[PDB]
Amino acid sequence: SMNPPPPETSNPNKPKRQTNQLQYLLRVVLKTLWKHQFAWPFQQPVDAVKLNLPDYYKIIKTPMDMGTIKKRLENNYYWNAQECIQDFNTMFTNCYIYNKPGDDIVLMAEALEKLFLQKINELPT
Numbered sequence: 001s002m003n004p005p006p007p008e009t010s011n012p013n014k015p016k017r018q019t020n021q022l023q024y025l026l027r028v029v030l031k032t033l034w035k036h037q038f039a040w041p042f043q044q045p046v047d048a049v050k051l052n053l054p055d056y057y058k059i060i061k062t063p064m065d066m067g068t069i070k071k072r073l074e075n076n077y078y079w080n081a082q083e084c085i086q087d088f089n090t091m092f093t094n095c096y097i098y099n100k101p102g103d104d105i106v107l108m109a110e111a112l113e114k115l116f117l118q119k120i121n122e123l124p125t
């Protein structure tokens with residue numbers, strides 16, 4: 001039930017950029033979602049072995065988590081805010097794909113996604 005290597009957080013040949021919005025995604029959006037009581041399942045890549053979820057990476061082919069996103073933001077890995085917002089949406093979507101409506105893990109992702117959309121509704125200029 002092995003785990004794949006985690007998503008890259010650096011890529012020297014990918015062009016970096018630092019923008020007002022990406023600074024905000026780290027300092028405001030990520031760091032406060034991180035403190036939510038429901039953040040803990042999403043703070044690191046899914047451990048299919050530890051969690052006896054041996055099928056997780058048979059179903060999820062584009063894994064993403066907030067730990068990866070935080071490191072990407074800290075590394076200026078992203079070209080723009082939309083790229084990072086895409087990663088957040090991948091990790092929410094993955095949760096909805098793998099699990100079922102009403103599952104408690106889905107209720108946690110739904111709560112975080114709602115807060116996420118609340119905070120990105122208005123970004124700096």
Ligand SMILES: C=CCOC(=O)C1=C(C)Nc2c(c(=O)[nH]c(=O)n2CC)[C@@H]1c1ccc(C)cc1
Nearest residue numbers: 040041042046051053094095098099104105108
């Ligand atoms: C089965 C034993 C418990 O294992 C866990 O704690 C889990 C972790 C770390 N992550 C995931 C789990 C899951 O069921 N579906 C997923 O997509 N993820 C990845 C985000 C399970 C889980 C988490 C939280 C609740 C409330 C229930 C189940």
